[PDB]
Ligand binder design. Structure first.
Ligand SMILES: [Mg+2]
Ligand SMILES: [Mg+2]
Lengths: 93, 27, 291
RNA sequence: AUAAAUUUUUAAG
RNA sequence: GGAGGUCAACAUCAAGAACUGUGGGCCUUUGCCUAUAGAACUUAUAACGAACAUGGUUCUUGCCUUUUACCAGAAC
């Protein structure tokens, strides 16, 4: 977030770390006529896959991507429910 | 989310840097 | 789409692309006539792995990158004429869509085991066996089965014309030229210059000059045949094909509505299967979305 | 179909 | 002789993913190659601390009469 001067809607706001964006070469490459607008490219993309969607990153780090999707299921309600029990959330098999 | 709108940061701009979508022009 | 930021550093970037192509096999690199470069890779995360490798390890320079885009293809849905710059050669090339089953059996290379439709790749095999395959499976044409010359990955080529009956040999000379104009035609396209796909080319006519020629007939056939393939297509009601990912989603049960919303938003908007996962609080939602 | 929030004071001259 | 101590001193704790000793061969001790023994503590979403302060120089800013005191980023 800091290096790219971006914020998660709940995250902190920092300084640019590269204060000059002002230099722009007038050139054909990124011109609108040559671009296809599908999907907005929200920030959370640019923070998620920083090298891909974000042109010219510097001092950026690798986000860690994914985890197993914990299925953990536990009971805080009754103390006398057994330890091993088939919870109605599960599918019937 | 900060989509590229707003300021590089609100320091010298004296404002609060508070940005909000415009209900005005959509369709 | 890659471009080196500081143009004077281009000769380094090239030398990195020659490494990446080796290291990441799936990557396919193209270069265009504008000097821009073209990367083709499996998906998001994969382009991330590259572009991180390309900015960090290999070419220490920094580079500009376009919006993520896709690859299209070009097809048709259903007089016919064509002309050389110097009218010694007059070509007419018809084209029509391929039957969905045919293509569906081409995209999967298949050895025709049992009653399976053989992949056309067996061209060296007897045209009588292959014709048996086509007429057997497709209700395919009896005359065309023998008429077929050759195919490429997305399409096949067929001959219907009288001089084949009048002069098969003089054409059999330059057949190996026509297939060159054919690959050179498929590699590009009329509209986006992107691959033609699923377009059956039936060759209606070819005209040959008097005295024939030696090396004039060699070169002059390929470009004219190309333009004969474009011209053949553009009158066929051409359309623009787009790839589709098969999405696989895994969610907790009560969140199923939310997932559906996303689909309706993304325009992919197809979820074919909802599979309970026995024993666990999960759902496999199988669907499709454009790239 | 929006949930985006800068500051802030003492001495000396 | 065992258990401890809100006791002390002396070592060691950021690196070719990395330590030390020893046997043998070449160069001429270093160094390279080969063989063998032992590796506490700290490290991979990287580190002695599952925590978290300040200072100096140099640049960029921000307040804005000037200096301390400062505004928020970077390098050492
Ligand atoms: Mg005075
Ligand atoms: Mg004075």
């Amino acid at each position: 977030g800091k290096a790219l001067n971006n914020a998660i809607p709940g995250g902190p706001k920092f300084e640019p770390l590269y204060p000059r964006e002002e230099e722009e070469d007038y050139n054909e490459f990124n011109s609108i006529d040559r671009v296809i607008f599908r999907v907005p490219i929200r920030s959370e993309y640019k923070v998620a896959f920083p090298h891909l969607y974000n042109s010219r990153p510097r001092s950026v780090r690798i986000p860690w991507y994914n985890n197993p999707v914990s299925c953990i299921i536990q009971n805080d309600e009754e103390y006398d429910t057994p330890a091993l029990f088939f919870d109605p959330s599960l599918n019937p098999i | 989310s900060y989509n590229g709108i707003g300021l590089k940061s609100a320091k010298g701009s004296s404002t609060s840097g508070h940005v909000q979508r415009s209900l005005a022009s959509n369709n | 789409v890659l471009q080196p930021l500081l143009p004077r550093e281009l000769p380094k970037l090239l030398d990195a692309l020659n490494k990446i192509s080796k290291y990441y096999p799936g990557v396919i690199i193209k270069v265009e006539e504008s000097g821009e470069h073209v990367i083709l890779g499996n998906g998001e995360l994969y382009m991330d792995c590259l572009l991180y490798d390309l900015r960090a390890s290999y070419a220490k320079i920094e580079i500009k990158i376009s919006d993520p885009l896709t690859v299209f293809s070009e097809s048709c849905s259903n007089s016919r004429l064509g002309e050389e710059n110097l009218p010694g050669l007059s070509i007419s090339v018809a084209a029509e869509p391929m039957d969905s089953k045919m293509i569906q059996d081409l995209s999967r290379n298949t050895l025709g085991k049992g009653q399976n439709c053989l992949d056309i790749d067996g061209i060296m095999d007897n045209p009588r066996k292959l014709s048996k395959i086509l007429r057997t499976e497709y209700g395919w044409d009896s005359l065309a089965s023998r008429n077929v010359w050759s195919f490429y990955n997305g399409n096949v080529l067929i001959n219907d014309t009288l001089p084949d009956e009048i002069s098969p040999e003089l054409l059999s000379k330059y057949k190996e030229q026509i297939i060159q104009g054919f690959y050179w035609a498929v590699k590009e396209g009329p509209l986006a210059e992107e691959p033609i796909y699923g377009v059956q080319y039936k060759l209606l006519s070819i005209s040959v000059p008097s005295d024939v020629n030696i090396d004039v007939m060699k070169s002059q056939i390929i470009p004219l045949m190309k333009k004969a393939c474009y011209v053949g297509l553009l009158t066929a009601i051409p359309i623009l094909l787009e790839p589709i990912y098969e999405v696989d989603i895994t969610v907790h049960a009560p969140l199923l509505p939310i997932v559906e919303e996303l689909m309706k938003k993304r325009r992919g908007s197809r979820i074919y299967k909802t599979i309970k996962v026995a024993g666990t609080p999960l759902l496999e939602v199988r669907g499709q979305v454009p790239v």
